[PDB]
Structure formats: structure tokens, C-alpha cells
Scaffold this active site. Structure first.
Site, PDB file in Angstrom:
ATOM      1  N   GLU A 195      53.735  31.168  32.946  1.00 19.81           N
ATOM      2  CA  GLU A 195      53.558  32.077  34.046  1.00 19.81           C
ATOM      3  C   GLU A 195      53.534  33.569  33.687  1.00 19.81           C
ATOM      4  O   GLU A 195      52.984  34.336  34.450  1.00 19.81           O
ATOM      5  CB  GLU A 195      54.701  31.850  35.062  1.00 19.81           C
ATOM      6  CG  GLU A 195      54.760  30.408  35.543  1.00 19.81           C
ATOM      7  CD  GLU A 195      53.695  30.116  36.567  1.00 19.81           C
ATOM      8  OE1 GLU A 195      52.924  31.131  36.823  1.00 19.81           O
ATOM      9  OE2 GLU A 195      53.561  29.049  37.102  1.00 19.81           O
TER      10      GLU A 195
ATOM     11  N   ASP B 110      47.552  35.901  41.738  1.00 16.29           N
ATOM     12  CA  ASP B 110      47.573  34.741  40.864  1.00 16.29           C
ATOM     13  C   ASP B 110      46.155  34.195  40.568  1.00 16.29           C
ATOM     14  O   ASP B 110      45.137  34.728  40.999  1.00 16.29           O
ATOM     15  CB  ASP B 110      48.637  33.712  41.285  1.00 16.29           C
ATOM     16  CG  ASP B 110      48.255  32.797  42.437  1.00 16.29           C
ATOM     17  OD1 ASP B 110      47.073  32.963  42.896  1.00 16.29           O
ATOM     18  OD2 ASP B 110      48.971  31.939  42.877  1.00 16.29           O
TER      19      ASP B 110
END
Ligand SMILES: [Cl-]
Ligand SMILES: [Cl-]
Length: 162
Positions: A11, A20
């Protein structure tokens, strides 16, 4: 290697609101803020999450705190899920980390939707499960991370992350 270091690699860490891979407002270590397109709706959720007026920016500590909550919630969700728990119980420690990784990325509902793969994991048919896991939007959208996760299920080692 452990679940925290694995997810920190998958991440990354960003101290300012960002979008994202799916275009959603996120912050810290993969902490989804909202699916809404409004940066204001995102700032609002952010402040609500941190308990302070942040102006879209947080500190390392704050990022790590959200991360601790999210991994805890991920584990607890699995153990509460009638479809996930049995799979999880049946697995070794490394492979357990792999299920946690998927849940963190796509939610308990999402993972629970991998019916066939879950059944294969429970039966310990590693190679077959890896092939089935790859026939998914997940794999098609984030192929490098999915390959890493998939390799972890196939081998039962942390090789992909080393
Ligand atoms: Cl929260
Ligand atoms: Cl990727």
C-alpha cells in the site's frame, strides 16, 4: 516478515489525501476515506477519523494509528464471517497473512465472493487455487500486487516480498 510489513509494502505510505488505483480518496497506509467524488466529503471523513481539523494532512503516527485499527478490524471481520473463518482456520500462518491482505484491499464481502478459490484453499490445492485466483478483475486491475499475494498462497513462504 509479518502482516504489517507485507501491507506496508503493498500500500505504501502517503501523508496527504490521494487517490487510490480506483480513483478513490485515501490517506496513510491504504486507508480508504470515501468513494464520493468530493474532496470535501473526503476532508470531512478524514477529520472525523483523526479527531482533529486536519486540512487533508496527517502525521506518521496518525497514519500508523489508522493502520493498526484497519488490520485489527480486518482480522476481526474474517473471524466473524461464516465464509471466511473456516478457510482462515484451516491455514498456516503465512497463508493467513495472505487472506488478511485481500480483506484489507477489497473488503470482507469481496473476498467472500471468491467462492471457488476459497474452497480450493481449504482443500490445500495450492496450484489450482493460484490459477483460479488469477481469473478475476482484481488480478487484472492490480496484477503486481495480486501476483505477490497469489505466490504467497501457492508457496506458503514470504518469497514474493523479499
Ligand atoms: Cl475510521
Ligand atoms: Cl499492482
Amino acid at each position: 516478515m509479518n502482516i504489517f510489513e507485507m501491507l506496508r509494502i503493498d500500500e505504501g505510505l502517503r501523508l496527504k489525501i490521494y487517490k487510490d488505483t480506483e480513483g478513490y480518496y485515501t490517506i496513510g497506509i491504504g486507508h480508504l476515506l470515501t468513494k464520493s467524488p468530493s474532496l470535501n466529503a473526503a476532508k470531512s471523513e478524514l477529520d472525523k477519523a483523526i479527531g482533529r481539523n486536519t486540512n487533508g494532512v496527517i502525521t506518521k503516527d496518525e497514519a500508523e494509528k489508522l493502520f493498526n485499527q484497519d488490520v485489527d478490524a480486518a482480522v476481526r471481520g474474517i473471524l466473524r464471517n461464516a465464509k471466511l473463518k473456516p478457510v482462515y482456520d484451516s491455514l498456516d500462518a503465512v497463508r493467513r497473512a495472505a487472506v488478511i491482505n485481500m480483506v484489507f484491499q477489497m473488503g470482507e464481502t469481496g473476498v467472500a465472493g471468491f467462492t471457488n478459490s476459497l474452497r480450493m484453499l481449504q482443500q490445500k490445492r495450492w496450484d489450482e487455487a493460484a490459477v483460479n485466483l488469477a481469473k478475476s478483475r482484481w488480478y487484472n486491475q492490480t496484477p503486481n500486487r495480486a501476483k505477490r499475494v497469489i505466490t504467497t498462497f501457492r508457496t506458503g513462504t514470504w518469497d514474493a516480498y523479499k
